[PDB]
Amino acid sequence: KVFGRCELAAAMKRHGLDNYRGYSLGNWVCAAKFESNFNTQATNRNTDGSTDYGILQINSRWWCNDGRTPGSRNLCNIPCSALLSSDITASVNCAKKIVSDGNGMNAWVAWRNRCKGTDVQAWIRGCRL
Numbered sequence: 001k002v003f004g005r006c007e008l009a010a011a012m013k014r015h016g017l018d019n020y021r022g023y024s025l026g027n028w029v030c031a032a033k034f035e036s037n038f039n040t041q042a043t044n045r046n047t048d049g050s051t052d053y054g055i056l057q058i059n060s061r062w063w064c065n066d067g068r069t070p071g072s073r074n075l076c077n078i079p080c081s082a083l084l085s086s087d088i089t090a091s092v093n094c095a096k097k098i099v100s101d102g103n104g105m106n107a108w109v110a111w112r113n114r115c116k117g118t119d120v121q122a123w124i125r126g127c128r129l
């Protein structure tokens with residue numbers, strides 16, 4: 001499914017993401033656009049053989065079982081496939097757990113490099129939230 005900016009924003013808000021662990025909605029939309037361009041199916045390798053899945057590019061090295069990732073754990077006790085459905089719910093649940101890992105949203109390379117410390121609310125905006 002490829003979301004537009006606002007569609008995902010409402011979706012993320014509906015799912016409880018504006019200010020989950022103090023991260024406003026704009027943070028969650030920002031990071032998705034740069035992790036996955038809002039493509040719920042987006043997948044990417046990682047140089048270590050792990051794989052990033054879904055709207056927030058959630059990594060099989062730790063967080064989901066894709067059955068083919070060396071030194072990997074399945075901390076969200078979910079198959080990486082579940083992060084790809086047009087339903088963002090699996091992705092949101094794992095990322096709620098990921099952000100409470102104590103690293104916060106720095107879990108997301110793109111959020112840290114391209115969202116952190118910017119006016120993130122410019123991502124929701126003009127959106128019928």
Ligand SMILES: [Ca+2]
Pocket residue numbers: 021103104105
């Ligand atoms: Ca934090």
